[PDB]
């Protein structure tokens, strides 16, 4: 189900923020287990020394959808890996398209 390479696992929002900061590469991203919201994943993104987090959860239809800023419809993907692949291009309702996968101890 959770077939993601950039899955740090159970890490506080601070850890994910410090991780991207250390990288120093825009477009970088990772995954974290929302503490306040158990069961939901958060996709962090590096941009101008910032960490944008998006709500990624699996619906009852077995699909993965991302929740971004208003005015942007949430696309439904069949696989979680397909989500990250779609965010690898402009025009996706985000601050910046992924460009530097923050591998979890596999760089």
């Amino acid at each position: 189900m959770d077939a993601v390479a950039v899955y740090h696992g159970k890490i506080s929002r601070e850890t994910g923020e410090k991780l991207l900061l250390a990288t120093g590469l825009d477009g970088s991203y990772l995954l974290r287990d929302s503490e306040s919201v158990p069961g939901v994943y958060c996709l962090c993104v590096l941009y101008h020394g910032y960490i944008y987090t998006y709500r990624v959860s699996q619906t009852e239809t077995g699909s993965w959808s991302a929740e971004t800023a208003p005015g942007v419809h949430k696309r439904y993907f069949r696989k979680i890996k397909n989500l990250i692949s779609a965010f690898q291009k402009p025009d996706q309702g985000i601050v910046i398209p992924l460009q530097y996968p923050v591998e979890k101890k596999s760089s």
């Binding site: 929002r13 923020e17 410090k18 991207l20 900061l21 020394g49 910032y50 960490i51 944008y52 987090t53 998006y54 709500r55 929740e67 971004t68 800023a69 985000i94 601050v95």
Partner: peptide, 8 residues
């Protein structure tokens, strides 16, 4: 230190 997270 301040706020490196912005969420969405």
């Amino acid at each position: 230190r301040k706020s490196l997270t912005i969420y969405a």
